Nucleic acid binder design. Structure first.
Ligand SMILES: [Mg+2]
Ligand SMILES: [Mg+2]
Ligand SMILES: [Mg+2]
Ligand SMILES: [Mg+2]
Ligand SMILES: [Mg+2]
Ligand SMILES: [Mg+2]
Ligand SMILES: [Mg+2]
Ligand SMILES: [Mg+2]
Ligand SMILES: [Mg+2]
Ligand SMILES: [Mg+2]
Ligand SMILES: [Mg+2]
Ligand SMILES: [Mg+2]
Ligand SMILES: [Mg+2]
Ligand SMILES: [Mg+2]
Ligand SMILES: [Mg+2]
Ligand SMILES: [Mg+2]
Ligand SMILES: [Mg+2]
Ligand SMILES: [Mg+2]
Ligand SMILES: [Mg+2]
Ligand SMILES: [Mg+2]
Ligand SMILES: [Mg+2]
Ligand SMILES: [Mg+2]
Ligand SMILES: [Mg+2]
Ligand SMILES: [Mg+2]
Ligand SMILES: [Mg+2]
Ligand SMILES: [Mg+2]
Ligand SMILES: [Mg+2]
Ligand SMILES: [Mg+2]
Ligand SMILES: [Mg+2]
Ligand SMILES: [Mg+2]
Ligand SMILES: [Mg+2]
Ligand SMILES: [Mg+2]
Ligand SMILES: [Mg+2]
Ligand SMILES: [Mg+2]
Lengths: 113, 200, 95, 85
RNA sequence: GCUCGUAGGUGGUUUGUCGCGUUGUUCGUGAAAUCUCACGGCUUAACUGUGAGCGUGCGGGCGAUACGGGCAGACUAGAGU
RNA sequence: UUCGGAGAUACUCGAGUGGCGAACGGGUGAGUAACACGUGGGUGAUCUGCCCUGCACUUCGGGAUAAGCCUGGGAAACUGGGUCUAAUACCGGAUAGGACCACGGGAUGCAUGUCUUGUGGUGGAAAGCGCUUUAGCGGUGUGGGAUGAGCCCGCGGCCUAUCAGCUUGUUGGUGGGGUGACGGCCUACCAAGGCGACGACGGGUAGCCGGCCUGAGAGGGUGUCCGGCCACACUGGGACUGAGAUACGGCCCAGACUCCUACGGGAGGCAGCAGUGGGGAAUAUUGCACAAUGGGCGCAAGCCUGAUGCAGCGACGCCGCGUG
């Protein structure tokens, strides 16, 4: 039936991914019915975005997520707000906010004067 | 590949001293070879070819790499000869020359190539790195107490530092303010003939 | 035990067919009328408005259409091998 | 064959063919018997062999032998032969 | 060689009307990738990710009627008597 | 308990029955000038396993068979017979509207009509297994979604008139048959039509597209990697099973070609991944791994996956750096 799966579309050593709704009778990089997110497993936490009002449409109508996408909808909280679990808030974490490019440059001018 | 040959020989053919000061040039300011003193035929293709050769061997850039610089100079807004010299100037070996950390262009290429420089704490060893705005160009902590780096300390006054970069004190680290437009670029060459060369 | 046992349909707006207006060239086909449509369209290269004609076969529940006859059609299910249209009404008949 | 499951399925494609052919042939020799009573203008057996021919069609459609839109197309045709006699 | 004529292409002045051509605007669609732009990530670059353009079109609704055309008339300068 | 045999009771499990999968994935461009493709619609003319959700239900019985065991035929491939045993296999009943027929209401329109309701008369289903004792997985009829698919139509993309008359189930109607469905799709009679100089009928060639190369653009050439769709699986035809079939690693028949034979008869299809021969100017390893992602089955642990992720090889191409 309808699956929610990942699609490998990066370089050779950089496996980027997209969370895509497709049929089970389809290859990986086929036609997705709708692309709803992305997943980059190379940053230091990760880079995870789920649209969270389209992932509620497809779960309510019968799309079975695969086993590594099921771990992602539990993290962002879109699975718990569909089955009615008390982990409904998102437990995802973003990377550390680095000091920007302008800030380091002004820190170096004051370091000399 | 690099040229790795005589440097005055390609300053004599172009009739223009390319490196900064040379005594082998101005004793023989005519092109080399056994037919060196002959009257050359002033073509229009010769004025356009040799003007492009002034830009390659001043910077040490091969033809398939200099052509890709033209393919994005004509594609950016503004002019074409302006932005060609803009992206040629932002090469990191040209940053070391203008900041007064090297004698000639061929040793500013090695000091980047042998890995004596960081940028954002990132160890670079490519001469064709294009520094953006607000980049710091720092020297390695290991590469102090070194002979070609201590000779660049007391000799920080004889050549002018351009206004688009700034050098600071006991840490010899270069701060890039903006990409240079036209005026602070040194001019041994006119720029509109390189644009007219590729139009052929 | 609480649900309504008949979920009503999601209301779909009724899609429409195409309607066209032509003349009549043939009638002698026993409840089948033949309509010559016309269509004008730019040339893909030279930019001139080109006038081209078609011939379609339509359906009569009652064979009242002479030769002439500004007609009006609407396309249907396949009614025969080559019939795809039906005669809706006749305006300013064969004079 | 070559695959282990394909020898398994060849033995079951022939069990299913002998099963379904006996059911489809029972429908052809029950619609035909209605066509005898309907063509004679009987209205006595034709009113009560219709009730046993349509009941054999619905049982053949629940067993997966014919499709349900095929059973509806054959019951509608035999019933309209009854109402015109 | 020259004329006559069939299909076709083309059409003077003017009033009214329909809004097919034309044109304005809006929703649906024009998959992703490639391509141009702008940033971001591989030490640079090729490569790669994201955002916006592009996709010259086509279908549905609502505006405009100058011009072309369809429909119903009028006029005498072209044409014929 | 012999010292190398007995004991299904018992987790685990060869062969076998049964469910689901095997129609996906992977390859190739021979055929096709066509609704094959691109694009925009139509389906009041349709189908849709597994998945999600609303409502009812999960009820009584019956007869066998594979395996096992004993035997016959054959050189083998394989196959006949007798006994014997189960089920979620199979078959027969009871009750259950979205099956049918007749007659009505209420809503809408785009002509056939469509959806929703009422009465009378006819009908159609199934199945249990497991449990450390709030393990748990299923079965069937139906309203509604989601996905996939079929069919029809408008417009679009080759050369040739030194191919100018093609067509008789051909064009249309009615009554039947057929189909998941409209339809000469098929059949019997009746009418005498249908297409064509805007290129019918024929001949040559060709998979189509997003794209790729060139160009100032308009155009011109092309369809290779990648991605969508179509077509084919030794050649030609044909059905079967199933929700779904060009059924690549299925069945039957005929043909060509290899191979076994005791001469009666049998076996095979790399345009899957590597690989060999051949042709040729010319194109690679009989590699590793299921760690990642996708798929199939199973409650699950898992098993399967030459899809895939990678590596080996060739300056074959782009990009980057060295030889100071
Ligand atoms: Mg190179
Ligand atoms: Mg008819
Ligand atoms: Mg099996
Ligand atoms: Mg019989
Ligand atoms: Mg019927
Ligand atoms: Mg005219
Ligand atoms: Mg006019
Ligand atoms: Mg696109
Ligand atoms: Mg960068
Ligand atoms: Mg990109
Ligand atoms: Mg519009
Ligand atoms: Mg077993
Ligand atoms: Mg099961
Ligand atoms: Mg296949
Ligand atoms: Mg028994
Ligand atoms: Mg009953
Ligand atoms: Mg039963
Ligand atoms: Mg006949
Ligand atoms: Mg009929
Ligand atoms: Mg008929
Ligand atoms: Mg071909
Ligand atoms: Mg040109
Ligand atoms: Mg291809
Ligand atoms: Mg190929
Ligand atoms: Mg072959
Ligand atoms: Mg079937
Ligand atoms: Mg198969
Ligand atoms: Mg094979
Ligand atoms: Mg091969
Ligand atoms: Mg050879
Ligand atoms: Mg795996
Ligand atoms: Mg997996
Ligand atoms: Mg190489
Ligand atoms: Mg070579």
């Amino acid at each position: 039936a309808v699956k929610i799966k990942l699609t490998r579309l990066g370089k050779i050593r950089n496996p980027q991914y997209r969370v895509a709704v497709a049929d089970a009778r389809t290859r990986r990089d086929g036609r997705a019915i709708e692309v709803i997110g992305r997943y980059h497993p190379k940053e230091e936490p990760s880079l995870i975005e789920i649209n969270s009002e389209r992932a509620q449409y497809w779960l309510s109508v019968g799309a079975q997520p695969t086993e590594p996408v099921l771990k992602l909808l539990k993290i962002t909280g879109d699975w718990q707000k569909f089955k009615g679990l008390p982990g409904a808030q998102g437990r995802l974490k973003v990377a550390a906010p680095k000091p920007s490019k302008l800030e380091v440059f002004n820190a170096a001018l004051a370091a000399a004067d | 590949a690099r040229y790795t040959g005589p440097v005055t020989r390609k300053s004599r053919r172009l009739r223009t001293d390319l490196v900064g000061g040379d005594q082998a040039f101005e004793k023989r300011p005519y092109p080399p070879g056994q037919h060196g003193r002959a009257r050359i035929k002033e073509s229009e293709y010769l004025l356009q070819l040799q003007e492009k050769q002034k830009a390659r061997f001043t910077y040490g850039v091969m033809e398939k790499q200099f052509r890709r610089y033209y393919e994005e100079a004509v594609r950016q807004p503004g002019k074409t000869g302006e932005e060609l010299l803009k992206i040629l100037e932002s090469r990191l070996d040209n940053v070391i020359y203008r900041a007064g950390l090297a004698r000639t262009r061929r040793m500013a290429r090695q000091l980047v190539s042998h890995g004596h420089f960081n940028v954002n704490g990132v160890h670079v060893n490519v001469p064709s790195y294009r520094v953006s705005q607000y980049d710091i160009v720092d020297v390695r902590d290991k590469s102090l107490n070194t002979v070609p780096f201590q000779i660049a300390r007391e000799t920080a006054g004889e050549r002018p530092i351009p206004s688009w970069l700034q050098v600071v004190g006991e840490r010899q680290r270069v701060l890039i303010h903006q990409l240079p437009e036209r005026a602070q670029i040194d001019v041994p060459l006119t720029e509109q003939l390189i644009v007219e060369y590729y139009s052929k | 035990v609480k649900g309504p046992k008949h979920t009503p349909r999601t209301p779909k707006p009724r899609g429409r067919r195409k309607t066209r207006i032509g003349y009549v060239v043939s009638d002698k086909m026993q409840k089948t009328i033949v309509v010559e449509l016309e269509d004008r369209m730019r040339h893909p290269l030279y930019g001139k408005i080109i006038r081209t004609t078609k011939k379609v076969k339509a359906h009569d529940e009652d064979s009242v259409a002479g030769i002439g006859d500004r007609v009006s059609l609407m396309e249907t299910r396949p009614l025969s091998a080559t019939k795809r249209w039906r005669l809706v009404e006749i305006l300013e008949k064969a004079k | 064959a070559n695959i282990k499951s394909q020898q398994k399925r060849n033995r079951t494609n022939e069990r299913a063919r002998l099963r379904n052919k006996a059911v489809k042939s029972s429908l052809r020799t029950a619609v035909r018997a209605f066509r005898e009573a309907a063509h004679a203008g009987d209205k006595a057996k034709a009113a009560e062999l219709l009730a046993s021919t349509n009941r054999k069609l619905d049982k053949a459609a629940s067993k997966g032998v014919i499709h349900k839109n095929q059973a509806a197309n054959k019951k509608s045709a035999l019933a309209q032969a009854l109402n015109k006699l």
